[PDB]
């Protein structure tokens, strides 16, 4: 099938440059143009530019001076680069493909790349268990989770049992602490009878800091 | 550029009902408008192209109409899976532009939260910080009160809340309240209590524990 896979999220300093790679499959870059769209809290969805199948590029006028898009047809990769980033350039960046080679109706999207523009440093999270107990077990249902604390920047992916456990899972939106670091909890409800036989592990991946942690959560 | 205005900002309906989204343009753009859906943590999903033309893989309940400056996206029978934001896009003029979006919320029957409390881990205490987590699980509506008391002393300012987006399956919310204090302070107190107030509760629910 048609897929667009983007490079991971990360931190970019003010006045520095941003680079994102878009690897595509299910079609050839010699047949289709690839567009770049961003989504920010201030300006919402914003079309940035496009690299056409022939090699020609168009940039939205406010970005023409600091945008450049390249590609390697053989490697099926498209390269996005934007100079002199400022704080309101903090956004999710998408690469996308249209239905036809010339049009602008975006039928296929990349997973997005959250780019944060700050002067701070990247920091991995510590992961602490939220142990199930009587204080969290009612009607045969036990609750347990993981505390993902003190990281920067967003995002952090949390899964349970390597993806095998999805129902009952709640990964709360991160909150910004006074320290300027994010913190969140991910919880899941399970049968209390499975606490003795099933292992429960939250899989934490903070891509910006390359921090991967598997945390086993047990009753205390 | 072409300014697209989406109205209204928020939209709250009940399952099975029909709902319409409005997208108005600053000047005529013919039928050159596309619609998108954005679910939680997702990328946009093309729903309708060119005002009314349908898209493969998109449920029949999604339709569109309009020409000139007034356009309408419709869902004839809303499901819980439809909880998302909806954006319009014009491409009659360069560069292509998007509207600000409309948030679709769903109504459901009142559901009282299940309340669980988590004392800080011994692992976290090794760092010199204590986090007490109070979980309010699967409730509707969103409004809820969480009161923290440590040794009968009302806590204020030292806790943070986070609320999930609406669940696509049962349309509920979950809430976390995290009381954070130093290891020193945590060891100087005994009773930690979390008191929950919600419409679905005939009485406030208190979850608590004694340190040690």
């Amino acid at each position: 099938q048609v897929q667009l896979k983007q490079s991971g999220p990360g931190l970019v300093q003010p006045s520095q440059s941003l680079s994102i790679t878009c690897t595509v499959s299910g079609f050839s870059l010699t047949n289709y143009g690839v567009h770049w769209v961003r989504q920010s809290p201030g300006k919402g969805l914003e079309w940035l530019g496009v690299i056409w199948s022939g090699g020609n590029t168009d940039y939205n006028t406010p970005f023409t001076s600091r945008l450049s898009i390249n590609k390697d047809n053989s490697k099926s990769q498209v390269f996005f680069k934007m100079n002199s980033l400022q704080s309101n350039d903090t956004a999710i960046y998408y690469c996308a493909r249209a239905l036809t080679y010339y049009d602008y109706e975006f039928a296929y999207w990349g997973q997005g790349t959250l780019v944060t523009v700050s002067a701070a440093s990247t920091k991995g999270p510590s992961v602490f268990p939220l142990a199930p107990s009587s204080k969290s077990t009612s009607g045969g249902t036990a609750a347990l989770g993981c505390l993902v604390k003190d990281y920067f920047p967003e995002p952090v992916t949390v899964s349970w049992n390597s993806g095998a456990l999805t129902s009952g899972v709640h990964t709360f939106p991160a909150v910004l602490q006074s320290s300027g670091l994010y913190s969140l909890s991910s919880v899941v409800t399970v049968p209390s009878s499975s606490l003795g036989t099933q292992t429960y592990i939250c899989n934490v991946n903070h891509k910006p800091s390359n921090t991967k942690v598997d945390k086993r959560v047990e009753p205390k | 550029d072409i300014l697209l205005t989406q109205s209204p900002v928020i939209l709250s309906v009940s399952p099975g009902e029909r709902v319409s989204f409005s997208c108005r343009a600053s000047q005529s753009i013919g039928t050159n408008i596309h619609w998108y859906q954005q679910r939680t943590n997702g990328s946009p999903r093309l729903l309708i192209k060119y005002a009314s033309e349908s898209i493969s893989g998109i449920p029949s309940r999604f339709s569109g109409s309009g020409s000139g400056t007034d356009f309408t996206l419709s869902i004839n029978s809303v499901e819980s899976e439809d909880i998302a934001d909806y954006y319009c896009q014009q491409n009659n003029n360069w560069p292509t532009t998007f509207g600000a979006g409309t948030k679709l919320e769903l109504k459901r029957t009142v559901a009282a939260p299940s309340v669980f409390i988590f004392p800080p881990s011994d692992e976290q205490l090794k760092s010199g910080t204590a986090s007490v987590v109070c979980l309010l699980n699967n409730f509707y509506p969103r409004e809820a009160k969480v009161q923290w008391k440590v040794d009968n002393a009302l806590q204020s300012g030292n806790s943070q809340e986070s609320v999930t987006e609406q669940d696509s399956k049962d349309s509920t919310y979950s809430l976390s309240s995290t009381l954070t204090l130093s290891k020193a302070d945590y060891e100087k107190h005994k009773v930690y209590a979390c008191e929950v107030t919600h419409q679905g509760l005939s009485s406030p629910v208190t979850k608590s524990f004694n340190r040690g």
């Binding site: 989504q39 956004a91 995002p155 939106p173 | -």
Partner: peptide, 12 residues
């Protein structure tokens, strides 16, 4: 409304 980078949803 304001777009939330964390949840990819609108926060009103």
């Amino acid at each position: 409304x304001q777009f939330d980078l964390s949840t990819r949803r609108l926060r009103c």
